[PDB]
Amino acid sequence: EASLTGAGATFPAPVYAKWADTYQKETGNKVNYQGIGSSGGVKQIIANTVDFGASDAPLSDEKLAQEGLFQFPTVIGGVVLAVNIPGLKSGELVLDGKTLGDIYLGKIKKWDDEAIAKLNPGLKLPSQNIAVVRRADGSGDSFVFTSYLAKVNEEWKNNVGTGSTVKWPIGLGGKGNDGIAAFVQRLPGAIGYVEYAYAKQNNLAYTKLISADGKPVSPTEENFANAAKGADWSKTFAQDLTNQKGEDAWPITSTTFILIHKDQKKPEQGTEVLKFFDWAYKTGAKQANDLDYASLPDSVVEQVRAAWKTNIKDSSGKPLY
């Protein structure tokens, strides 16, 4: 029976928590996971205060090497726009990238703006102030969301840019996915970006979006998976899943990563971290799919296992997988 600690990204926290609960029931092993956001996950693994870190934003090959870290992907999810719009039900409103960016720039102030109406011709829209919500903490959702906005809105690209932290033009700061979800529930007219499970499991309304190919798409597990169908995983785990081509491709999709040290100074801990994630790849797909995360293809899992064998060792050079 091992006791393991992880910390970081809130994007996959619902599935990691479910996996950890099941794993304890089946094996006795205890995995404690603290949702502090991706930037904090990176900081904590570098400081050696946890057994594993978690970040939705990938580190570069060079940064991994400088830090003596190894990164591997777990699941595929989607970022959605949770909304609180009087008179509208979930899934009714459509936004496109340009107009979403103009909302986040503060240019569009009311839900019945002509640009929103044009995207939604048969819908009656209220004259409700838009209340923009964004992340306060350093965040992989912010990284993915601003990476998307920079592709679809030139003003955003040139003035705000992309990052885990940016100079937001407008918007209240929520801490974690949970904090944005709580703000959208409490504020008539809110819009906030959250990983899909935080909208669904909190009974929050959400929008459709226009795909890269120009078609309205609903956020679903299958549509997150579709956004990754063009990814050449053989080349790198650090795949860009925003604004990807193809039918029913959710435009704000991302995978998410675990970070561990290559030279394990507590090699029993590292061995047990690998066993937890291996168990999750072998047995955990229903639990992920229940929370609307798509599973990585088996080929990707096999790449992860092969890379564990060559990268993860004790201080004598012995592999831990």
Domains assigned to the chain: 1-77+230-239+254-321 (3.40.190.10), 78-229+240-253 (3.40.190.10)
Spatial contact of 291 and 197, defined as CB atoms under 8 Å apart? yes
Who's near 1: CB < 8 A, 6+ residues apart? 27, 28, 29, 30
Dist CA 125 CA 127 (whole Å) = 7
CA distances from 5 to 27, 44, 272, 300 (A): 16, 11, 11, 25
Whether 243 and 101 have beta carbons less than 8 Å apart is answered as: no
Amino acid making up residue 299:
S
Give the sign of the dihedral formed by CA 238, CA 210, CA 194, CA 198: negative
| Tokens found for residue 44 | 């904590």
Amino acid found at 274: L
Give the chain's length.
Answer: 321
List of long-range contacts for 121-128, beta carbons under 8 Å, 24+ apart: 123/88, 123/92, 123/93, 124/87, 125/85, 125/87, 125/88, 126/85, 126/86, 126/87, 126/88, 128/85, 128/86, 128/188, 128/189
- Give residue 236's Cα distance to chain centre: 18
Task: Give the whole-angstrom CA distance, residue 101 versus residue 169.
Answer: 11
List 205's β-bridge partners, or say none. Answer: 83
C-beta neighbour count of 75 within 10 angstroms: 23
Across 116-144, b (16+ Cβ under 10 Å) vs e yields beebbeeeebeebebbbbbbbbbbbbbbb
Technique of determination: X-ray
Nearest Cα residue to 100 out of 58, 151, 64, 51 = 151
- Of 216, 190, 80, 75, residue with least CA distance to 128: 190
3-state secondary structure of 71: strand
C-alpha 53/C-alpha 67 separation (Å) is 13
Strand 131-135 versus strand 30-35 pairing type: unpaired
Beta bridge partners of residue 82, listed in sequence order: 192, 206
In this structure, what DSSP letter does residue 254 have?
Answer: E
